[PDB]
Amino acid sequence: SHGCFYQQVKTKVFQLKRKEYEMKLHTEAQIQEEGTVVELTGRQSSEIT
Amino acid sequence: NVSVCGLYTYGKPVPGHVTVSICRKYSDASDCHGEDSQAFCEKFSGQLN
Numbered sequence: 001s002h003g004c005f006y007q008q009v010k011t012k013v014f015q016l017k018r019k020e021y022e023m024k025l026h027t028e029a030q031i032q033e034e035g036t037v038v039e040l041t042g043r044q045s046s047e048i049t
Numbered sequence: 050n051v052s053v054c055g056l057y058t059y060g061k062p063v064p065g066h067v068t069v070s071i072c073r074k075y076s077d078a079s080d081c082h083g084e085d086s087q088a089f090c091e092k093f094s095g096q097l098n
């Protein structure tokens with residue numbers, strides 16, 4: 001409350017080689033006291049140049 | 050299914066903290082300063098009975 005959820009993820013698990021370009025980032029904020037599962041596939045624009 | 054044991058004489062086993070691993074090399078493309086095809090693998094741990 002009065003905030004979010006923050007996280008750092010190690011990119012070496014992806015081994016970004018052998019044809020790798022785009023990657024989707026799905027979400028699933030399930031609001032408590034509501035059976036409401038509103039997702040959001042945001043920033044499906046993260047890139048590797 | 051996969052298993053690992055340890056004996057020596059008259060089949061007398063020995064107890065030890067085994068640390069087995071199971072990996073694969075996709076295309077032996079010779080390192081390129083990022084491991085010689087060290088591609089993703091689940092390692093394991095446990096004690097021998």
Ligand SMILES: *[C@@H]1O[C@H](CO)[C@@H](O)[C@H](O)[C@H]1NC(C)=O
Pocket residue numbers: 050
């Ligand atoms: C692998 O383990 C299962 C355990 O239920 C067994 O049924 C199966 O026969 C095993 N594989 C071989 C080749 O024996």
